[PDB]
Amino acid sequence: SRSESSIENFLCRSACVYYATYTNNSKKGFAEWVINTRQVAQLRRKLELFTYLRFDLELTFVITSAQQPSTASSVDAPVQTHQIMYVPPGGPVPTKVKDYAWQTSTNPSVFWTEGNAPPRMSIPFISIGNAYSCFYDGWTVYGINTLNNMGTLYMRHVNEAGQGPIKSTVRIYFKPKHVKAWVPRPPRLCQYEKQKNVNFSPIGVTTSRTDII
C-alpha cells in the first residue's frame, strides 16, 4: 500500500483558495484575484516541500447569489449571468465595471447563467522558464522572481439592475494536474507571517518534556 504517497496523489487535490463578494449596482462591484500559491496556509506548506514544480491548472467557481433589501413594489428579476475574465501575464487590466478591458479579444472569458453546472476552465503551464520556482534567492527588490506570473481573474455581472440590488459570492477552487516535482526540501517549522516573503519569528524546535529520562 505504497501508492498514496506518490506525487500525483499527494498534490492533485481541490482546495478553496479565494472567497469574494461583488454587487451589481454599486459601480465598484467586481472581484479580483492574482493567481498565486501563497494564499492559504495549508496548501502553501504542501507546496514548499519541493523547490521546482511544473503543473497544469484547473479552476472551478461555485457562484451563488443573494437578494439585497430593495425598496418596494414587486421585485422580479430573470436569471442572472456572470462573466469570469482571465487576463494572461502582461495584458490589459480593468479598473471599473464598464471598461474597455472587458470587451477585448485576447482575454479568454466564460459566460455562465445561474441554475446549471459550475463553470470549469483549465489553464496550461504558462511560463518562459521550464519550471515554476517556489523559492528565489536573488533580486528582481529581494526574492520576487518575476518569471512565474500566471495571471489574474476578474468577475462581474452582465445584467443591469432594474428594481433590486443583488450581491453574489464566489469560491474559486484550485486543482493541479500532471504534477512533477524536483529537489525536495525540509518542511517549514515557524508560522506564516506574510504573503510575499519568507519572514518569520524565531521559535523553539520542539515542545518540551520534563527530563531526559
Binding site: 500500500s1 506525487i7 483549465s122 512533477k180 525536495p184 515542545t207 518534556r209 531526559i212
Partner: protein
Amino acid sequence: GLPVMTTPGSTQFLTSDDFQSPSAMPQFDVTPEMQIPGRVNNLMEIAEVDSVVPVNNTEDNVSSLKAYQIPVQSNSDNGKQVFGFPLQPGANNVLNRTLLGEILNYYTHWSGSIKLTFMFCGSAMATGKFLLAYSPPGAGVPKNRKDAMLGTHVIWDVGLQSSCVLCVPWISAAGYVTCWYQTNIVVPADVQSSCDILCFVSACNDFSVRMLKDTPFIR
C-alpha cells in the same frame, strides 16, 4: 437523434472528481522540458534520509542546539540511565517534528520499521561501553541495569566503533529505547571527559501509508 437518459448525480460538483476539462488557452505551444537533477517520484524517498532527533528537550534546550546532544560524563555510580524515550506515536514525543515524523503526520494509517543510528561525537582517546535496551510493546520499561540486560539489547563499545545501528518496528504502550551506562568513560590526562552523543532516525524502506489527512502543525 440518439435517445439518452440522465442518471442521478448529473449536475453536481464533486470536489474529488476526474473529468476532461475544457482548455482556456489552446494553440499555446507550451515550453518543453529540461533535465533538472533530483526528481522526486514518491514521498517515501524524502523519509529515507536520516535526521537528527531532538532527544534532549528539557524546557531550556529547545531554543538552542543543545536539544540534539545527549550529555555523557564520567560519574561515580555504576549503572545509570543515559536517556530514554518512548515510541508512542505523535503524543508530544521527540520523533514528532523530525523529517520522518513530519511526513507521517499527513496520513492516518502507517506501518513499518525504523533505523536508529547513534554516533559518539567525543574525543579519540576516550573509551567506554553502553547498553541499548529495546523493550517490546507490552513489557514495562526496565528500571535497572540487570533487567535491561535480560531483554533484547546491543552492547556498544565506543573504543572500537563509533556508530551503532539498531533496527526496530514502529506502528500507529509501544516500546522504549532506553540506554544504560555499562562502565564509565576512561580518559587519559589532558583530555576533556564530557562527551556528547547524537542520534539519527530513518525509515527502513518497507513501510506504507494510507488515508491522507491534513497536518495539525498549523494554526
